[PDB]
């Protein structure tokens, strides 16, 4: 349950889940990826559909 914020200090997502890391070229064991681990919370307004 880590809050993901933008450059404006606003919480834009919530991330929680299980880390997946690779199991002589050793893999990086201090960095992992979570697929679909973050759920969005805020929506950015856009001008799409306006104007010509």
């Amino acid at each position: 349950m880590t809050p993901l914020k933008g450059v404006d200090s606003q919480v834009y997502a919530l991330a929680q889940g299980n880390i997946l890391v690779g199991g002589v070229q050793v893999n990086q064991l201090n960095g992992g990826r979570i697929t679909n681990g973050a759920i969005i919370e805020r929506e950015l307004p856009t001008q799409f559909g306006a104007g010509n």
Binding site: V7, D8, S9, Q10
Partner: protein
């Protein structure tokens, strides 16, 4: 607030409402001195207490 805020910078005040801490630590000291002196002393003396007969005129 929707403004941009950096992460790694030292959070210095940047706008009108920002607050800053001031440590006075003021210490000023100035001194001035001057002196002058002048001394003159003189003393002259002359006396016979015994005058030769030939010099008695002067």
């Amino acid at each position: 607030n929707y403004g941009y805020q950096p992460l790694f910078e030292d959070r210095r005040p940047r706008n009108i409402g920002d607050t800053l801490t001031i440590v006075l630590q003021e210490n000023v000291s100035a001194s001035k001195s001057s002196s002058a002196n002048a001394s003159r002393d003189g003393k002259t003396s002359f006396g016979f207490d015994t005058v030769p007969r030939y010099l008695q005129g002067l």
